[PDB]
């Protein structure tokens, strides 16, 4: 059967032929409660207290107990289980190339990494999830060290020179859609470039970036108060009023694409994709494949990063204190196996339940390549050139850049829009809203005794009235 | 896109690695999440706690 | 008075997110429920449901 399945493309033998041969069969949960499973064929071959001699079925491979997002975790049986849960959550938030034809698609949100790499340390289940073909992450030289204190409490220090060389640089694509619509011939919206002395109620912005069809062109720099679609609706001397589509505030970019077509009912319909290059930043979220989430605390240049005797500076420095309570030992084994993998020139196997791969074997392999067997290296201080007294664990670990940038999260309000009903600030940063000074905050300011600050938050910084 | 080779999909500006399994409704890709339920046609006997019934068969 | 969230906008942030969304199972019991039993990893989930992949919080 294996010799026939080595040539699917020749013999036309397939999995369905393996089912029809009576070799495998589908067992559901209620039938599984009467079967007797061997985890491996090592169980079928047994001696002494064989435990069982009436095995009815055998597992094909136990790593099939895991799903899609848990099958990219290297050494998941060396991690604490909540960390595998957290990585299964954060693998859906990681930047890569989400699909091959992303240039055709105009999705509302899209994040495309510049240089996605396949992991040096993979599971075999990754060959069927197409993670080799649409990878989300970069193999980073990660050092696990306390360096200047800017990686404490789940933070990372990044190499600024690496970031300059394109390390984890990505693109944010945002699409805006608009369409003409006659709400009767009374309204009759139209894509045209607005004129100051013709249209009613502009937003004090410029319209010269628009072309004559009311639409901006690809390749034009845009900012927060910049109009991308000029749409006017006739009022039933200002014959028409402005209902233009604006770019969302504080996010600059370049109009990547403008697409014009007809909708279902035949009106002109435009989708504009705007491209914004996101360079990694202080406060951007990065994660390993082991639930080691964290924001960038600082970025140091290459001459400031600690360096080995070869001049290798880590791309990322993470705190040692992220490991012990978390017990993500698979992170350390992935780093060691990735050092061995990069030195040997092979893609390391981190299939979960594998007795062929062991920490001692990887350590002997690493010692064969002129390194310390436990992954430590003598690192020198970048600032002073002195040897660091401790020897730093360092090597290639696959990191992911998560969708949560700070620039999509930073918000501030002095004054601005208020709600119609209660005349309090609006909701969210998308509408220039205020933050909620809720009930528990009121309780804390009661306990503080700050009566005037409680008053000013709850009366005259929200909704004064007479 | 059924039965089309990867060259045929790339000529249609479709990703061959795209799995399918979703619908396009008003240009939006919608996926039907599978929904759990108790199995039908099977007798299940439970014990309603803090009830006037001690045991309860159900189908 | 009908079930909500059966059809969801397909996640396209990553290929892994798309694959995970297309193979998603949902227990339609209220997320405000404070009983642990439907949320617990049952023994019968071996090889049928991933023991690791589950959301954080109410679900």
């Amino acid at each position: 059967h294996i010799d026939q399945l080595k040539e699917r493309e020749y013999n036309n033998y397939s999995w369905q032929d393996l089912v029809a041969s009576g070799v495998v069969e589908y067992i559901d949960t209620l039938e599984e409660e009467t079967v007797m499973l061997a985890m491996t064929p090592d169980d079928l071959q047994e001696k002494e207290v064989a435990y069982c001699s009436t095995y009815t079925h055998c597992e094909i491979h136990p790593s099939m107990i895991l799903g899609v997002c848990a099958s990219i975790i290297p050494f998941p049986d060396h991690n604490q289980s909540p960390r595998n849960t957290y990585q299964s959550a954060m693998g859906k938030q990681a930047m890569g190339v989400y699909i091959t034809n992303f240039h055709v698609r105009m999705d509302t949100l899209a994040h495309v990494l510049y240089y996605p790499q396949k992991p040096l340390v993979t599971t075999r289940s990754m060959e069927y999830l197409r993670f080799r073909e649409l990878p989300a992450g970069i193999n980073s030289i990660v050092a696990i060290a306390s360096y200047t204190g800017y990686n404490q409490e789940d933070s990372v220090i990044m190499n600024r020179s690496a970031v300059d060389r394109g390390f984890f640089r990505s693109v944010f694509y945002r699409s805006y859609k608009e369409q003409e619509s006659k709400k009767g011939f009374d309204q009759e919206e139209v894509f045209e470039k607005p004129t100051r002395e013709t249209c009613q109620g502009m937003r004090h912005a410029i319209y010269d970036k628009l072309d004559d069809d009311g639409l901006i062109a690809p390749g034009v720099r845009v900012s927060g108060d910049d109009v991308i679609i000029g749409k006017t609706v006739t009022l039933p001397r200002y014959t028409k009023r402005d209902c233009s589509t604006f770019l969302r505030t504080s996010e600059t970019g370049i109009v990547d694409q403008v697409m014009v077509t007809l909708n279902q009912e035949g009106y002109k319909f435009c989708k504009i994709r705007v491209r914004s290059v996101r360079i990694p930043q202080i406060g951007d979220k990065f994660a390993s494949r082991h639930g080691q989430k964290g924001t960038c605390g600082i970025q140091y240049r290459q001459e400031d990063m600690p360096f080995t005797c070869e001049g290798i500076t880590p791309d990322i420095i993470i705190n040692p204190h992220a490991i012990p309570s978390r017990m993500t030992i698979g992170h350390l084994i992935e780093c060691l196996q990735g050092k061995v993998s990069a030195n040997k020139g092979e893609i390391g196997d981190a299939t979960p339940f594998n007795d062929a791969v062991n920490v001692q074997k990887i350590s002997n392999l690493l010692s064969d390549y002129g390194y310390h067997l436990r992954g430590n290296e003598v690192l020198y201080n970048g600032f002073t050139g002195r040897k660091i007294t401790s020897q730093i664990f360092i090597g290639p670990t696959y990191y992911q850049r998560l969708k949560h940038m700070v620039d999509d999260k930073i918000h501030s309000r002095a004054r601005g829009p208020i709600q119609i009903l209660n005349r309090q600030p609006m909701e969210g940063r998308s509408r220039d809203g205020g933050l909620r000074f809720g009930e528990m905050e009121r309780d804390c300011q009661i306990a503080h005794g700050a009566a005037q600050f409680l008053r000013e938050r709850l009366f005259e910084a929200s909704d004064p009235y007479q | 896109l059924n039965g089309l080779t990867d060259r045929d999909l790339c000529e249609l500006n479709e990703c061959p690695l795209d799995p399918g399994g979703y619908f396009i409704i008003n240009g939006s890709e919608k996926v039907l999440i599978a929904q759990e339920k108790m199995a039908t046609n099977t007798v299940y006997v439970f014990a309603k706690k803090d009830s006037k019934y001690a045991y309860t068969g159900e189908c | 008075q009908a079930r909500a969230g059966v059809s969801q906008v397909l996640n396209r942030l990553t290929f892994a997110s798309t694959l995970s969304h297309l193979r998603r199972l949902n227990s339609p019991i209220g997320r405000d429920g404070k009983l642990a039993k439907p949320r617990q990893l049952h023994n019968t989930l071996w090889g049928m449901v991933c023991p690791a992949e589950t959301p954080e919080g109410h679900a």
Partner: peptide, 29 residues
Amino acid sequence: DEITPDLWQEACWIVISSYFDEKGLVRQQ
């Protein structure tokens, strides 16, 4: 003949590759 223990990892990943060649990942939908 029986698959020996030293060829078992290759054999099992061959049959897993065959399964994912036929069925894929969204076969239930």
